[PDB]
Design a protein around this ligand. Structure first.
Ligand SMILES: [Cl-]
Ligand SMILES: [Cl-]
Ligand SMILES: [Cl-]
Ligand SMILES: [Cl-]
Ligand SMILES: [Cl-]
Ligand SMILES: [Cl-]
Ligand SMILES: [Cl-]
Ligand SMILES: [Cl-]
Ligand SMILES: [Cl-]
Ligand SMILES: [Cl-]
Ligand SMILES: [Cl-]
Ligand SMILES: [Cl-]
Ligand SMILES: [Cl-]
Ligand SMILES: [Cl-]
Ligand SMILES: [Cl-]
Ligand SMILES: [Cl-]
Ligand SMILES: [Cl-]
Ligand SMILES: [Cl-]
Lengths: 218, 218, 218, 218, 218, 218, 218, 218, 218
């Protein structure tokens, strides 16, 4: 089952619980958090207390955290404790990648790595046993249009995933919309983060249905 | 230079010369004719007299003919005489593919083959010397959304083209729009037929500029 | 689970409901319809009203339709509406293979292609997403002994199926009997159409049991 | 032993027995019949009664029939009964290629397939056991100069033939003459159909001797 | 045409305009700036105002900037605005390699990456579309003799460049002189940065001519 | 553009200037000199003074020299000084192949190697940088019919040429005529030396036009 | 000869000379220093003065330094001057890997790289000439049980080492004990760092003998 | 789920039911019987009556039999009748390997082969359909320390298992303990027989938990 | 240990013993003799009596003879008897290469082959057992600058040498100097002949030391 995981960075941050509840009622799968610390990428978004606030509001859906921060261990711990169901970080952001993946897994949740557009897949080779998911960035994080060179990367990561025999989710984030989602999905991507395409549309339900329709034909 | 070739089937057929002149003034390269005979595909569009009419109106731009007809030789001759600058037909539509390509070339114009979504590239192997262009159909002809399985076909045809050392244009037709054009272009496609995306838009200029912008980044 | 799908063309057409009910009670899985239009193959068998008649009689088992007809779209629609659970047709019989597969799938049922003995597997490449099953003909349709050259074809199709990671049923039809079924099954075939071997035998139960016994040892 | 098989289409049709007897006395091996029905190719040549007439005249040499007709089964039967020693037809011309090859073989004679210039060799794969010969067309049938792209096809068919371990004759037809015959023979061709080069020459003997001389040096 | 691009770090910094004008009159192609910020490498050289000063002096030749700085975006902008015609930076020096390449290209100039001796070519894979040139460092930046292990790297980068079909300049910098330049050029290098070998020689003209002579024989 | 280079050995040696002027006016590209010293091959043809005589007569077309002599350096120098535009020699004829190629190039003209029928292409490997052209002999020099085994050699040399990325002319000499020229051209040959086929024909213009016609279809 | 190199971090730091002398008398080969600066890894261990102190105490055995520090050059110099016989550092810890390896070698001692569990072997490719040894970390540095994924890494590094024809020591550090040492050794590892397994055991001699016994059977 | 199958040969044979019940209550999966006949290996252990005795005692857990006997058929029958859930034997111990595997399967239980350290995997090739499990011996049967050369064998058998698409358990027996179990598991082993490591430990629960902990991290 | 073997052709031939003694005292390894007979190459140098004269003078260093003569056997014998320690000759210079190598070896000294720039390595294949060394000529013998195309040849010969498992010295001669020696050495060359670079320098010691310094870093 292909996941549609709306990115809350594009939601109504003044009525976040309400907007999240609505997007989930409209067919979304998990809620996605693009966490930025103004150092690894040039913006600052939201901390673990926002995730905790959504748990207290009653959101029970999965909460996927993408850490665009450096270093990463303190935030792995606080987001895990706040209620994250998965956490991914960038290999370049940790001086001990394997230890950071193990730390995530010590909380009984999904761990993985996020890759900037220029970043290859060699970082996955030796930490395979601690990879539950991979996140492909298809825009320059914290700065757009989907970067088409990422289709081949998704194909290469799919191949690697198949060679492991493990269930590893392949997700993408950056410029995803109903018009390019099928083209990305044929490359092996099973999870899609969308912000603007969903939260800025007149009807979350209709947008998510259009996406599902394209995906069902891949 | 990547070509943007508007398909006149989507234009104002009651003011065709005017609409064609406008799309060319807005940045289009060549005018594309999707010719259907109600037999090879289930609709009927326009004959060689429409192309001749545009020549008499003063259109000097290239006129690319895609024959979705069967058989094909009589129409190759009439479209060539009317002023076509290129003609492509489907291999399944001729009982003498090589002879039909030679016939097109006897008029001093570009020849090639158009491939339905299910059709592979083996048909190109032995007629290589008479292939100036290949047209990939990315929708079911005469019946939609771009068929994502066609990205890999475009990659395979690009590879074949590279192996020949000849200049062979790789074109695509079916559901092309500003949101998926870059994803198709990274697969080796150099020419894009667009109908609805251009002719049904408020500004031909702005639509064509958006397309050029995405293409310039591939 | 390997399927044994009796072909009703060999059944008692004067007491069809009764014969079908009996073969299903004896261990058969699905009922197979070899539909011929006297044009694609040189005989005429039965139309969609026969399938509907079996539904009205109370047969709830799967009903697999093999269209040995040309063209195919009108019959896809009528067999689907009559209650077919799967439909396959020959690639050579449609001028728009992908569209015909999509049409079958629009009815919420299984789609696929049937291949004559001389026909290779290149036709499966670009329509993969719309293939739920493949039918190998092991006799010359509408005209016998199993054609042994089909074992290697079954092996090649099995390999292709494995490379897709999708669940695609591999079925065979033509001269299947208890003495050659194990030899066909070791080549990757999971579904067997048998007519004469079952319907002309003294005991459907014993014949089907003999088949199951050979299959259980592959 | 390389065969030189004159095509009677170029002979004196008003004194056919006499011209055939002369070409055989001059060193020809078999008599070749290019049969056209005005449908598969755009001309009409001769029926089975012409072959029978040559048998009644006393010609005992092999009579090779190339069917450029569609459909093909009725003519396979009549040419076989008239006294043909081999029959080849085009795969595209039969809806049941394997059955048509079997039909030819049921008469105790050689069977095979003829390939138009654009046609590849995939059609030979699954009918191998019923292929005694392959005919490469090196001109557009029923419409010339030898098409040089056919040299590589002959090389590929030779390779396929070697991989089978069976004795399969590789023949070519179209624009063969004493000046290009050696170049075709080095590609694995063992039988040559020549019409004009032989029948329009001043001396059949000298022309056939020149051909033999070039062939003996390959 | 092979480029000889003198590095101004070796020029007379007290009479820079004069020395640059002289080296260009002697046959040099472009002027090369090795920019160091005392952080990425252990020295400090010159800022964008030196490049601007040369533009104001009347130098119209290409000005190639090699940024041995970290981070890189602010300097990309200032060197571009000062009049640079190309800018390269080290992948390790940016946390957003693709974004930094795009930034360079937003100024309408050439972009690329510079590689330290230990750095491999995997960084080029996913940013290919934004690479106009690659700079191989053949000495330890900011610290010599040409490092011979770089010949194989140049061969590997040449191969990669050929596989892209794009025109990508392959340049080298570090210990280049008339005695080793031909050996580097046979490995696929098309542009040579030389400092000491040119600026410390008695005659710029004779040194550049000697270099051209060796290069013309590769 | 494919070259047709008539060999003057077949021209009217008593009215050479006149015959050369006529063949060039009829469409020939360059004039070819097959120089023999009675030692490397068993005949003696013409020295550098004949080439000089043609320059003095006013022939400005390219003059290609094929040295079938041993040793070769003195004749390289005299033919170059007489006005040759290219010189090729046989590797077996020089004890210093690289030096001999360099000598040719020292005159600012094209250099290359000529290969006897038995000679392979290993001689080209290490002198690549000094090879502007390769001449395939398709008859036994100084002694005929085109040797068909040379088609595969031309294919292998074409492949080697493609692997170098350099522009290297591939020429052939020996038994070339209008009937076999297309078959040779499909193997990658771009230049054709013809003697008898042109100079012994009734009309140089018509012969050269026939050749061009066959070549235009490859 | 396989090395057993006890890590002093596990020794009695209050009676270090005595404990080192004892472990060497018990069969140890070299003394291993895991140097941490609280920045590259989250602990602080010991500086060059501890190594010097052991030299002054009379320890003449080899002293291998593993720098888990960033940056690394100042410590390379001080550890070398204190009496180190080998120094390895992490590629990620230096902005000039080749220069840092050269610096180590300038002291006439062994140089190499240490790899964290997630780190691949691409860093070794271009600095090969300056690599005398490689250290595989089999635990997360400065934070355990041997990480089994490191066996395959050791196999890949062994293969690389064999391809160089140079003598490069392959060492491992992290969770090594008598029960897993043979399993690591069959993967090509020739040197073993052990801390706890040796220094916390009742008899250094018996522990080292047990290790030798397992190693002798690989 | 990875299996931990204690070998009863190391249990308290005077209180076997009690010791087995305890090890199962402590987390063990199946009970393993290493059956020796003093001929195939140099010791004698226990017959089918011991297994029956455990069934009568109330042990309902799986009972895996490893026959280190020769010949094997009589014992296959008696162990099956006594209540074995799987039986493996050595290929060298039967003169009819396929028949012996079929015999095991005739009892409706799992069959497979056990391999001595020197024995390769070719024996599995043709009996694949009757292989439910493979047992790797990692010590010399009936005579120790784990033989490290068996890691590569486990990798090769895992690869073979993957190529079959069947669910085949890969088990190992000989010198397995908590310190080497993770290293064996990364090679594809899913079932572990342990005797001494479990039955001679102070707490079965703690030992089995330690094993599970290492396995959970692979 | 890399050899530096000065070529006496560049020494003071009027004070040869003195110049040789000096170059050896300055760090040279062996003395190299480039012997030319005015036939194989266009100069005449020195005969075996010069080598004997150096032996009588007291030179005990190795004396390597490179025969650029044709034929070669008489000179092999006289140079061997005069005191040569190795002799190499060109394959093209002997009609019995294997016999000539055996002749050299019959004197108990090293034998090998010298290769002109154009000459490939196929000549080494079948005489491998009699090859102790290979000499690559990097200039045109007896006529310069190092020919850069020879780097790849050295790489190919190194590979061949590695495949033999024998100790075969790889030497180079022609245009070697301190500025290109490291670049040649990274390609697998272990011995360097230098004439001018050493004998025309102010200090043999300093030149040889500079060479050693570059070589020590490869
Ligand atoms: Cl941290
Ligand atoms: Cl780490
Ligand atoms: Cl037609
Ligand atoms: Cl045709
Ligand atoms: Cl239809
Ligand atoms: Cl279609
Ligand atoms: Cl028919
Ligand atoms: Cl059929
Ligand atoms: Cl920045
Ligand atoms: Cl980025
Ligand atoms: Cl000479
Ligand atoms: Cl030479
Ligand atoms: Cl530092
Ligand atoms: Cl560096
Ligand atoms: Cl038995
Ligand atoms: Cl057996
Ligand atoms: Cl001799
Ligand atoms: Cl010999």
């Amino acid at each position: 089952h292909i996941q549609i995981n709306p990115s809350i960075l594009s939601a109504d941050l003044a009525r976040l619980g309400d907007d999240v509840k609505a997007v989930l009622a409209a067919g979304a799968d998990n809620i996605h958090f693009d966490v930025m610390d103004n150092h690894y990428v040039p913006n600052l978004t939201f901390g673990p207390m926002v995730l905790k606030a959504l748990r207290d509001y009653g959101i029970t859906a999965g909460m996927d955290v993408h850490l665009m921060v450096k270093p990463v261990d303190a935030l792995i711990e606080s987001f895990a404790k706040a209620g994250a169901t998965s956490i991914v970080f960038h290999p370049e952001a940790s001086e001990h990648i394997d230890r950071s993946l193990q730390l995530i897994k010590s909380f009984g949740i999904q761990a993985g790595l996020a890759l900037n557009p220029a970043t290859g897949i060699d970082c996955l080779k030796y930490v395979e046993s601690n990879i539950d998911r991979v996140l492909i960035m298809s825009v320059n994080p914290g700065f757009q249009k989907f970067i088409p060179a990422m289709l081949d990367k998704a194909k290469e990561i799919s191949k690697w995933i198949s060679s492991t025999d493990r269930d590893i989710l392949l997700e993408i984030d950056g410029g995803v919309n109903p018009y390019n989602i099928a083209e990305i999905a044929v490359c092996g991507v099973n999870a899609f983060v969308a912000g603007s395409a969903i939260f800025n549309s007149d009807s979350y339900k209709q947008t998510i249905d259009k996406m599902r329709d394209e995906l069902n034909k891949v």
